[PDB]
Design a protein around this nucleic acid. Structure first.
Length: 626
RNA sequence: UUUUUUUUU
């Protein structure tokens, strides 16, 4: 029964050996294959081996869903109630009790816990799971746990790794042993394209057609790059199927991407009807976050939309670029979850061998780092450039982050953390947003600022479906403030609140309920943090300008003037068509982010008055006679 | 001027 499942897993074969390996070495690298089941077993093995006696067993996961899934299964396998001996902790949800002995958590959570307790006294063993994904939190934890083990001999650390990176991990973690566990995974025949494919979208559509018409049963999973590309692919495929007479077997074409509402996301999981073949046209969300059952075919175009930060210009760049080998292999493996399968790679073998990096560049080496830098300074680490990162971030990215924190008053001239800086690090957001919150206290608009900040944290607020695009834009424009997007975000939350937090209201007005529910969770958390720091939450009422004054305290660098050209570097930047300021004239502008997609676009742009810049940032804005 | 992959406190 329950025991039978634990024994079937291969990891049971090395159960005694794992426990001894953990006893023998303080830091152990574990290479776990897909079918190993190390996530739900190693945790227990140590708990049954008596490791639970003086500390807790913590295991990180890079995803919230993964943390709750595995905690549910390990609770069921241990036969206790979730929250008792086996619990989980993620943001807004601490499902643990004084009886908790095994604790699954998000890496983020443990990172934030190490700040208040750098020795992590409550834990006897820490396991870093799915570390091959190389989130910023995981990378930070590598360094911090390495330092912590020297202080704490009793602490035991386990770091899961990919096969290629296992040796690299070992040398970094004091040349400690590597434990490899075999995993049961069904074979996937990988077919490369004979010649390079000029158009990856067309090739993917052609390949879907081929498979459906000429291959044995089984649903297809296609990896594309964005929402517009996927919706265009769905429309095109449907029309090609119709072109053929109704004699040809039904092809159910379903998109999947995070912006897609949870109902429509749910329709992908549903089993296909009799004598029908499903194709799921997906982003990289299907690679790890979404696991779809009964996929036997994968079409691999070979591209992903990748974020890369340019600190010189203070701008993210989203570029469709070739995936990595690791990423390509992950994709292939999705055909092999339910049973044996095939993967059609639309690139030549040479291109896998020579045009694709063996590993995706880690997040820490291509994102803004202000948030990370502030946290590390808060923990009292100072020469961050020399800090023991496994893969060190670009030097310019670290210097700009440091300059940013200096400019906001988080750091003094000597580089050390200020009282403001310490306060700001207790808030979970980029430092520029925490600056604005604390500035809003003095400016008497804290109540509005909190909700606004909360909205900024969220992703995909306004739903814009393909067929009903115009209708969405109309409903969105009812909320537009004359000043632009920040106050528009305020309106959306207030109107949601005033409708009694209705999911119906959201659907009607083409607004993602998932986003609004998260905003309320974020808001409640922020309000608690404000109270702890004795910062009062004050409403500005009608005087909304006070919000705009507060925004300049944090976002003075992100400012532009119409011809728009950036105030600092003079670089041209453009209002995004979604903006409430789009068709409108406004001479002086403030924006939340500068992202380069097909054009350099300001995101969440708001109109400002230059007075507010010299008021809020006196040192950085000089007043001169013309 | 015409619309952003994934994910974390």
């Amino acid at each position: 029964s329950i025991k039978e499942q634990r024994e079937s897993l291969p990891v049971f074969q090395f159960r005694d050996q794992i426990i001894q390996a953990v006893k023998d070495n303080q830091i152990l690298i574990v290479v776990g294959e897909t079918g190993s089941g190390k996530t739900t077993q190693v945790t227990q093995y140590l708990a049954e081996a008596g490791f639970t006696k003086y500390g807790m067993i913590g295991c990180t996961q890079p995803r919230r869903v993964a943390a709750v899934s595995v905690a549910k299964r390990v609770a069921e396998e241990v036969g206790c109630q979730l929250g008792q001996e086996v619990g989980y902790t993620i943001r807004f949800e601490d499902v643990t009790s004084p009886a908790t002995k095994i604790k699954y958590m998000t890496d983020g959570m443990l990172q934030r816990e190490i700040l208040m307790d750098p020795d992590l006294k409550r834990y006897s063993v820490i396991m870093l799971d799915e570390a091959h994904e190389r989130t910023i939190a995981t990378d930070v934890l590598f360094a911090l746990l390495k330092k912590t083990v020297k202080r704490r001999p009793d602490l035991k650390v386990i770091v899961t790794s990919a096969t290629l990176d296992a040796e690299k991990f070992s040398e970094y973690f004091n040349s400690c042993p590597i434990f490899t566990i075999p995993g049961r995974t069904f074979p996937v025949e990988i077919l490369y394209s004979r010649e390079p494919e000029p158009d990856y979208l067309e090739a993917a559509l052609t390949t879907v057609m081929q498979i459906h018409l000429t291959e044995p049963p089984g649903d297809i999973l296609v990896f594309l790059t964005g929402q517009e590309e996927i919706d265009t692919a769905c429309e095109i495929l449907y029309e090609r199927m119709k072109a053929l007479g109704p004699s040809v077997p039904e092809l159910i074409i379903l998109p999947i991407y995070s912006a897609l509402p949870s109902e429509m996301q749910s329709r992908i999981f549903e089993p296909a009807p009799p004598g029908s073949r499903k194709v799921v046209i997906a982003t990289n969300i299907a690679e790890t976050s979404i696991t779809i059952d009964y996929i036997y075919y994968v079409v691999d175009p070979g591209f992903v939309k990748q974020n890369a930060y340019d600190p010189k210009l203070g701008m993210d760049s989203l570029v469709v670029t070739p995936i990595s080998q690791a990423q390509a292999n992950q994709r292939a493996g999705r055909a092999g979850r339910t049973g044996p399968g095939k993967c059609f790679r639309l690139y030549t073998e040479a291109a896998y061998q020579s045009e694709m990096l063996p590993t995706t560049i880690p997040d820490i080496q291509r994102q803004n780092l202000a948030n990370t830098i502030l946290l590390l300074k808060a923990m009292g680490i100072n020469d961050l450039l020399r800090f023991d990162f496994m893969d060190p971030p670009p030097v310019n990215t670290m210097l700009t982050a440091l300059e940013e924190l200096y400019a906001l008053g988080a750091l003094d001239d000597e580089g050390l953390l200020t009282r403001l800086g310490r306060k700001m690090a207790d808030f979970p957001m980029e430092p520029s947003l925490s600056k604005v919150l604390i500035a809003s206290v003095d400016k008497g608009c804290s109540d509005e600022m909190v909700t606004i900040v909360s909205m900024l944290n969220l992703q995909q607020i306004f739903y814009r479906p393909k067929d009903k695009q115009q209708q969405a834009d109309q409903k969105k424009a009812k909320f537009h403030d004359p000043t632009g997007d920040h106050l528009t975000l305020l309106n959306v939350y207030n109107a949601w609140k005033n409708s009694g937090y209705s999911n119906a209201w959201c659907f009607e007005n083409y607004i993602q309920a998932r986003a609004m529910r998260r905003a309320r969770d974020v808001r409640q958390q922020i309000v608690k943090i404000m109270e702890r720091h004795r910062h009062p939450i004050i409403s500005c009422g009608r005087d909304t300008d006070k919000i705009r004054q507060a925004l300049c305290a944090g976002f003075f660098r992100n400012t532009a003037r119409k011809d728009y050209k950036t105030l600092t570097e003079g670089t041209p930047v453009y209002l995004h068509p979604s903006s409430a300021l789009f068709g409108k004239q406004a001479e002086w502008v403030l924006y939340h982010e500068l992202v380069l997609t097909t054009k350099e676009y300001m995101h969440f742009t708001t109109a400002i008055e230059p007075k507010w810049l010299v008021e809020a940032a006196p040192t950085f804005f000089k007043l001169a006679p013309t």
